Amino acid sequence: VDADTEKRINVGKTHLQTLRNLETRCHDSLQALVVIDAGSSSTRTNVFLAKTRSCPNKGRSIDPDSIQLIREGKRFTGLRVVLEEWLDTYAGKDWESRPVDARLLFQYVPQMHEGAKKLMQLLEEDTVAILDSQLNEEQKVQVKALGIPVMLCSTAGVRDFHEWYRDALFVLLRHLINNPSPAHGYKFFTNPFWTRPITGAEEGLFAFITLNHLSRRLGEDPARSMIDEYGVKHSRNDLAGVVEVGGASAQIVFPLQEGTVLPSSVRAVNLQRERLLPERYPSADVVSVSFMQLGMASSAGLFLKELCSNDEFLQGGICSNPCLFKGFQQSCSAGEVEVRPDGSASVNEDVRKNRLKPLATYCSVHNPEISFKVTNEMQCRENSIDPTKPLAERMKIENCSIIEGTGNFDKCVSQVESILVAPKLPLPANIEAASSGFESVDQVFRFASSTAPMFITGRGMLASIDTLKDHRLLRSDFSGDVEELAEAAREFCSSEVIIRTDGPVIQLPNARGEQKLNSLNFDLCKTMALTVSLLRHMAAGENQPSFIKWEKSIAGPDGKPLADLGWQVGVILHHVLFTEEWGRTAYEAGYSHNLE
Amino acid sequence: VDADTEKRINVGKTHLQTLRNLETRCHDSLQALVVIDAGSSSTRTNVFLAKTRSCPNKGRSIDPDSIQLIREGKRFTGLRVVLEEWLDTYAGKDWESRPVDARLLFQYVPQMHEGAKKLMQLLEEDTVAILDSQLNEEQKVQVKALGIPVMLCSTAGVRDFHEWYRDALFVLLRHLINNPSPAHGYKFFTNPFWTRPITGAEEGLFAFITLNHLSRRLGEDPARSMIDEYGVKHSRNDLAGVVEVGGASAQIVFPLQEGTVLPSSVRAVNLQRERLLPERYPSADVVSVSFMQLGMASSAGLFLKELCSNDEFLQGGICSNPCLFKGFQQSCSAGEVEVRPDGSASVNEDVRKNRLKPLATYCSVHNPEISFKVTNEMQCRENSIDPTKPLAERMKIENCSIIEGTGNFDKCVSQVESILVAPKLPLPANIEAASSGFESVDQVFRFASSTAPMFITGRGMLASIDTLKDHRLLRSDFSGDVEELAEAAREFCSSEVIIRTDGPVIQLPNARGEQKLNSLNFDLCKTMALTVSLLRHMAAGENQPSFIKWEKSIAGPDGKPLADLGWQVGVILHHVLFTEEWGRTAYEAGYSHNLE
Amino acid sequence: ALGIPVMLCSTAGVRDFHEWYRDALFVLLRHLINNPSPAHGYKFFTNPFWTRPITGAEEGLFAFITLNHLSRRLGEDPARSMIDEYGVKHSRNDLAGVVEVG
Ligand SMILES: [Mg+2]
Ligand SMILES: [Mg+2]
């Protein structure tokens, strides 16, 4: 009797203890976080999931290690196209070639709102579809109750935009995000801190935060850091640097090592001082520099313009391109290229699709940045763009009908060096890089350098190495050997274009094999030349990286990558890591700040 | 042309400025706050509305001046009845008269949860009905999105509850509040800081905060306070004290004035030090003391027991009650009284309805507070309750059949003084008052006193003054004059009970008029005697109040009262005023802390 | 008893100074300030936030703060500012700008 009732008493005592436990413990809940990448080629959503924890008398915070990308959405229109379309309608067609009174454009602010609305509705539909498809009903309840912070950040595409247009657009973009469709129940919200243009330096810093976070090099716990006898927290492992080559710009980011000698002209960033990371995180002094015109699309347009305006390459209407394969031929233009099933290359005539449009638009005498600044005019003229001429002739490669590939890798490297990496004057729209002390890529490793390991990122940068690895031209364990890379690329780039029944083919010189010719690999040799040039510049630095790695992705704890490389995770971390500020903005004010 | 387009430009510029304004300004939103009064006679909901404000980088807070009561709900069962019913079923009937092994009751914790559930569902239904009826659709959206903090606090009814029962009940009450019906969409939530028993001293302190808040005496802004040359914030007007007489206990609260001489045995509370008010509020040292058995219901039972066990009043089965009118007669019991249409008084026989049940239940040899403590046993025996006897004889007024009113006010005052205000031993269940240095009401003004103005509150306390004012026995501008009150009450209380066709009547001695005899005024003369006794004790103090006011309510800025007097507003303020803590618990953790 | 904070700031004279020289000099200047003569009893002290070169923009911003402070245009109290119905604090008087030619 007494033994059995003592157990019954213990069940009642347990029932109370289980409830005491519930009201004393921390409770975990799922939150969705949205990063809208307003890049040069497109505007795309990035839907993330994170675990939030609420503790009695401590508030709510995000576990930074729980941040995972659920999906990167569809590639919708870039903000540049939205604005230029608006100008076409309200300033009139060919505003690129005429003086425009910017003051008059203020009467068309509601119309800019209507144009922006169209894009915002597509992004909202895409975000909601991703959320509806990935979450279960219990997850949706949590995600819907917590609120969904939105961080729409613009990069190189509208970085060089003229007048007040872009900043007025941001005010409208935030208003649209703050008024989501009530039907879906997802409570999206933003503020001027989350949704804004980000500098190239910030863009680079955020990609550096992403890399070190995912690879477990960056952390604040005993596993990733150590506190010395003088109370200074050091990272347990070396923080790695990053080279990121996107569509319009390229970012070079590296932490500075102990006893680093910097000239007064070079401006390095302290992560804590510049409020990128909280005080509890290990300190670092980081060089972050971004170069406009160094992206895949923008350098392709600029390289063609410069190379085919050079008499060493332009003769009798034929521009001899050493960065293109033997047997490859295209119309002499910077228009978007399509490798057709018949082996022919079709150059798109649409001005909006021409890789020189952003540069030729910037380089105009009707842009106050050119008309008032000889400096900028001279940079434009140095790349064969006369800002005094209409848009059509600024984009035109004069007395040039056909571009023919010569497949000469060393000539390609030589030209990539003189045009892109080490030009006489800084490439246009680079006042930010110049202000931090760097006119060009060649100056980055001359003025500052580090033993910090380096990661090379970007779609083209990886395709360059992976292509050479696939044809067994490079070893699988390639660690950055310059001569090994140049020798491999010299062989691959001397390949002939053969037009076969199953479509065009890239034929390797010594029966080494072959691959299909397409719109993504036709000009890969320019990127290999960029890689070679970059590696030579890093190799010349006073301090060389401990190692160089090419990575598509970083594996998570379960062997599967939790998120992509890039600035997106970094921007999230930059806000969520400041616990108090995040609690106030994300939870205290929250989506309810928008209530009618 | 230029004048008209300049205006069109100004409309576009305005559109942007309006949006910049929205994303820079503070935004106001409506929140509902719920206070559940778990009192001695009942458990009732109190639904409040408040204006919250969210500012960029400042979080969210409540404007304390916006706190308004929307409705006080229905009187559902008190927590004492829930627990005693549970004991009746699981410890067996008449557990009040037998030894009970409390350890064995642990096996019935789920059953206590089921009993508590029944009451919680009624309170939730009542709260939701009030919210649905008072709010419009835009208000409901705000109220539903913000979350609804619930503060269920118990007072005198279960303050003296035996064993571990009450605290186990609170764990269950919180779990029930944290799991509301999902159907209504109102997100109710609590935690151990909001939902808990409150001491009599806290209860008094909260009623003091309510009074001074509503009357605009308490404040932190230049309108209600001033900062001196030494950085000390003083209230602009004197903070007033409060006497609150409820159903089971009476609270006496007053701030201490400059250079106040306190004996080491008297424990005064500092509002800031004891964390009742934040640092930004003016400081005050407050005497707060609560007396069990001084409430309307509890003193009525105790007074009858004591008076009718006295040979000066009990003779030949007739107890002569000087606190009852000439011609009034009732059965000799402390059972609930009903003045019937025929003029007869029906005494309820139900043990749960007897005004002595709480005291006779406390005063038991099977209660460890009596069996281990001679002190407590002696206090019980001093009020004619033998703790060794069964419940039925502890509640019984021995050799007494009929109570007859003598309408002798001075004899009534004399008895209220000896029984209630200045007893030989402290009235039972008063260890809290005794610990703060006060055994009885008479000791409060002897040991501590203040020039601070005083407010007299409670349903009966006000009816006492208002009755005498209505019959023109007291002037409309009555300011506390003892002799004026005693002279008025002596006249009113010498009234005869006449049984008329339209029902029973209270006939005033010198054709002064009349009023109906009912269940609420039959024993009002005891309360008038309590008032007289209290006023004499305050008048004897070293420092006397600047003024004494009887108030039913305090008028708001629009001439209409925003809330009632009592501890409810005070408990809200005690939590909402600590901005950071409130933001973390109410908004950061919020109702989402409960998400599955 | 309170200690004497020292703010040594350099302006246009060494703003255009080449190589690493100036920044190495600042590290030495701070060490010197942090080691005053014990004889006089005045406790001078600095840190890298107080003692450093200031940019032309900071120099201008600081002169703007000086002007508005002294002229009573800049303040957070009711005399120099007003909180609107939306909780935003505005300066009561227009903040003035500055042209400083050194
Ligand atoms: Mg990008
Ligand atoms: Mg009460």
From Swiss-Prot, chains A, B:
Q: Which Gene3D superfamilies match?
A: 3.30.420.530, 3.30.420.540
Tell me the PROSITE patterns matching this sequence.
GDA1_CD39_NTPASE
Q: What's its job?
A: May perform an important processing step in the conversion of high energy nucleotides prior to uptake by the parasite. NTPAse-II has a specific activity 4.5-fold lower than NTPAse-I in hydrolysis of ATP. The primary difference between these isozymes lies in their ability to hydrolyze nucleoside triphosphate versus diphosphate substrates. While NTPAse-II hydrolyzes ATP to ADP and ADP to AMP at almost the same rate, NTPAse-I hydrolyzes ADP to AMP at a much slower rate (0.7% of the rate for ATP).
Could you provide one GO biological process annotation from this protein's UniProt record? nucleoside diphosphate catabolic process
Chief place of localization: secreted
MF term (GO), any:
nucleoside diphosphate phosphatase activity
The reaction(s) annotated as catalysed by this protein in its Swiss-Prot or TrEMBL entry are: a ribonucleoside 5'-triphosphate + H2O = a ribonucleoside 5'-diphosphate + phosphate + H(+)
Which locations, inside or outside the cell, does it occupy?
Secreted; Parasitophorous vacuole
**Coiled-coil regions listed in the entry:** none
Q: Which organism is it from?
A: Toxoplasma gondii
InterPro entries the UniProt entry points to: GDA1_CD39_NTPase (IPR000407), NTPase_alveloata (IPR017227)
Glycosylation sites noted in the Swiss-Prot or TrEMBL record: N399
According to its record, what are the GO cellular component terms?
membrane; symbiont-containing vacuole
Active site per UniProt: E203 (proton acceptor)
The disulfide bridges present are: none
Give the protein name, as stated in the record. Nucleoside-triphosphatase 2
Keyword annotations of the record: Glycoprotein, Hydrolase, Secreted, Signal
Statement: the UniProt record of this protein carries the keyword Hydrolase: yes
Reported EC number(s) for this entry are: 3.6.1.15
Task: Tell me what happens on changing Q68R.
Answer: In strain: Beverley
Q: How does it assemble?
A: Homotetramer.
The domain of life for this entry's organism is Eukaryota
- What family is this protein classified in? Belongs to the GDA1/CD39 NTPase family.
The UniProt gene name for this protein comes to NTP1
The transmembrane residues are: none
